[PDB]
Symmetry: C3
Amino acid sequence: VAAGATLALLSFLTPLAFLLLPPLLWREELEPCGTACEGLFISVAFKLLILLLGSWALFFRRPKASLPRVFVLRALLMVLVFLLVVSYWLFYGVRILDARERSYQGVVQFAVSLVDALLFVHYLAVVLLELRQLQPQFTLKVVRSTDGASRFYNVGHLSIQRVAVWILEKYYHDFPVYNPALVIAAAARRRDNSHNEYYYEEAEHERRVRKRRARLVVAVEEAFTHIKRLVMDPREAAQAIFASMARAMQKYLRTTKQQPYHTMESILQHLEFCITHDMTPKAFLERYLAAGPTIQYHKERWLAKQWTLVSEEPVTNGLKDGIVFLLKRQDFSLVVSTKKVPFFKLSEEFVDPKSHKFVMRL
Amino acid sequence: VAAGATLALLSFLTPLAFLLLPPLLWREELEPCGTACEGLFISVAFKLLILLLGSWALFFRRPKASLPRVFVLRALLMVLVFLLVVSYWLFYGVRILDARERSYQGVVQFAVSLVDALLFVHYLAVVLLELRQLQPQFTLKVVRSTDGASRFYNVGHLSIQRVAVWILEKYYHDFPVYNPALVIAAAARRRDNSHNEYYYEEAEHERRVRKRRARLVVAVEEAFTHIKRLVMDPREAAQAIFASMARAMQKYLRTTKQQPYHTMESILQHLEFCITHDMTPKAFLERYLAAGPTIQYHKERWLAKQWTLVSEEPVTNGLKDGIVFLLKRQDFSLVVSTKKVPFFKLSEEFVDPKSHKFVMRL
Amino acid sequence: VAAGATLALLSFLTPLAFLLLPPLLWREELEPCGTACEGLFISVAFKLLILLLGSWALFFRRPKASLPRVFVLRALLMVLVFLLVVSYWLFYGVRILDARERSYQGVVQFAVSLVDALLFVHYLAVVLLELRQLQPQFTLKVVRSTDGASRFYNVGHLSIQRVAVWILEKYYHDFPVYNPALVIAAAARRRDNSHNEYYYEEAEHERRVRKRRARLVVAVEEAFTHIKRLVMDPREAAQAIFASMARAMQKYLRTTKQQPYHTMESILQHLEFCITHDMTPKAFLERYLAAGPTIQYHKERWLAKQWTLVSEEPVTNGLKDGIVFLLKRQDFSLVVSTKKVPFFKLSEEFVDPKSHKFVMRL
């Protein structure tokens, strides 16, 4: 990442060097030129300000991911910046600096062309890195291998590793959080005719979850009726009203297998959060009634540095119809299937709004 | 917004002024120049057409929101357009217009550099206003403070007010519509051991909602069997078949607290809409069975001009990990929590499709 | 589509022709020029490489749809490329080629202006085709006319046919798959007071779906316990463990009307898929328990070449508040209603985090 900052600093200082070396080295040898040179100095100044603000807006940011192989398009852009700036330096050396060029208008036009080329490389960087994948080309079915939480997405032309990082960004807010606490045909006919134990255990579990949920709703309502706006801190008020709801919260988190997701300190911080921002009991309970996504919880449960990209294809290739890859973790795996978004043939049919006529029969 | 139109008109007329003032003021004093000048006139004409079509496509539109503070990047762009065009006017005045420049090739190259700079400012405007927030940087948990309807979003680098307008654009089609019609530990142990009244009231409410829903489904099916395609207007046919379903619709909207959402005229317009476009009874009922989002209903219920941005941070700053802000309204409040999308470290693992081998034991 | 490739090849070869015809036709007549010409040759080479890589990244791809009328903005871009390149050819012919221009610096600057104009046309193409619709302007309610599956979307400034293709791209992964197997007021009062047959048939159907689902879950769990990692192919292992679950799968697909969606070969391929990628029984069953979207199934069920755009407005116009159009198919119709995203007026309200004070009463 240091080579990118080196290329950025060199590319920013190279037009200023190309403009400031002939007045510093051969000033009296240099030919005087008219107002066209100074107008091109103004163009260099404003276009370098545009280049600096654009590179600030899109490229002066930390890397959001560590890819297992090389970023192909970003390495292409770095090689393009390197070869462009090195070729401009080589030409400026062997045909302007060593030759002691007198026509300063040509040197300033050369710097103008350099800044135009750097702005066009910045535009190509936006095209390659951000604009290429806007048009949706593929539909991704992403399924957890453990509980079968499935979402579908539309993705554009990206490589498999960039699609993988994209899916991991969707995963932490789209799927529910992972919870690990949640002859032959004749034997199958004999077993399927037996007592349907799982049906009644499921009905018992749904019934007792609804009962513990009702106890929790009544507990948190009667808890939030113990305070009112106004001396007592929201931490102290949350600690006061937690005692009238800790037992029903503990019972509901035991019956829904959500015990290690919510410590007592996290529930106290979320109580302080809810009574600070004037949230009702139901807006408090929405964090606890359902499972909720992975980013809702503590950072020790994210484990975002422990993902593994398992693909039979080399992961720098783009997607195609039939690509399946795994986003493995120590706990589960995200199975990703790729299908091509199909070709559409729309036809146009005109109807008349007058032509909608009706009868009373059938 | 008038200053933006003034800057746009001035920036469009400034290259034409820079090209047309030397033939109008000093024509016989002006030096003749070759075909390079006329080729640059062609470049000025086509690049100004490109600039006009791009500014039409992205910037000749009404403001979608009224922000509580200044749009920082748009004011930066307006200051950049102003300082660029004013500096080109000052140089053209004090070094071309007052000096009566004879080298017309330099003046036309100066206008070419001006149009290139305006196209680069337009590109910087697209980078700052639209391309900066494409890369998702933050996950937003947006929760209504009243009923706890929660959605998560990925947002890029935006200020808090632009994130707020973005969330309000997501709110009108993502959340359901707001419906306002919907010692201590020993006392909590005594209360949680009492009769679970809320559980049975919830079961009674779900049962009677399912019964009124079944009555409504049978009513709307038998209502739509009273007409057929073909003389009778769809308004007249909707008014005819509404009488066989108005009672069950009124009972279902009473039992689900959806009475002021649906007037009789709105249900008649939606009946005319459904029988016009050949919609089934279930496609009619999907508007009424669930609550549905806020933009599905009448404009007096949107109240989009009554939002309030409550943030402890000054709202022109970008988001960071831990920003919480409220989108208050007179009825409720959207509590928005910001978390950073975590850094990913993908590793690559190669598996062999031949290496998937299986046994029959366990 | 051949005219677009012809314009692309002509636009790529035109600057090289403008640079290479004066050394090939009048070489000794041609005036020698300094290092400014060669620096502009370097600028032409790198900017043509930028133009080639950008046109590869965004425009060297197959059309994703067949629109019923002309793509208005793409035809505008093709007319702009055609008129620009034809005007540069006409000027180069009648003022450089026929006149036998000696000032070669003007010819090379003319080619530089041509490549700058082509890069600006490419930028305008990105603005018109991709950047115009990023800012969400409209909310689309898309409802199937048969079962009332409804989704809402935010769309930007697009024409009705491009919005239609956009909705069809959202449709194949957002909606569930279409399943066709799923005086007057006094008579309505008499019928609504009768036996609520549909309520009890619905409760019976939900109960038997839960029972067949429980049988299927137990069957697929006991089926996946018949194999283990390690000689036997995943096709052979899937065929072995399918016999202990085919009866409960067939019963669940009969009771949920999902019989023609899943052939025996498709279930065997998905079993091989799940045991290959170490998916649990629940991750196998997520494809079968719910309906799921249309792209999840076989390509004979997509029928993406059979959509019909029914609009009272001519479909090359952009959306506005109140546009309703149909995306008809032989089976159903997607009714699309357009509403304008409302204007927001945010106000700012500062609260003090110290000012959150609380009491114990009420």
